[PDB]
Amino acid sequence: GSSGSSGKAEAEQNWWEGPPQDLSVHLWYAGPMERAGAESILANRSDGTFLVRQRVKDAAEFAISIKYNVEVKHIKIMTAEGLYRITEKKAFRGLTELVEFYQQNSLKDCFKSLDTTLQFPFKEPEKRTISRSGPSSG
């Protein structure tokens, strides 16, 4: 193909009824949204925005899309027996951790290209260096 259809998917309609546990809980969430759907989000928002999107190929597949360098970047997240990792050297246990971790470790370490780390989520960033340590957990 080597092409990219056009779309906006602009429509605010919440016809849900108290949805159970879901990525929503996190300040950042992204459904099956397509490329354009993510780009526009990190394109219109402030420089350094990010989010978590899932792939169609494998239900159990996530991706971190962040806007940087006048361009929207994306990363393919892996999943092993309920695990999460984007590199062979580094490996995490949960998606949340992988995210709350990058905020401290510049993606430049792994993705030399991206000389920046998660600055702001999809919904809203954090304040007062708020974080939740993992005591004997993980």
Binding site: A63, H74, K76, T87, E88, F111, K112, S113
Partner: peptide, 15 residues
């Protein structure tokens, strides 16, 4: 083929 780099690539230089 087998290889697939649709997304960003990790540190290449660093073997």
């Amino acid at each position: 083929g087998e290889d697939d780099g649709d997304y960003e690539s990790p540190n290449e230089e660093e073997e």
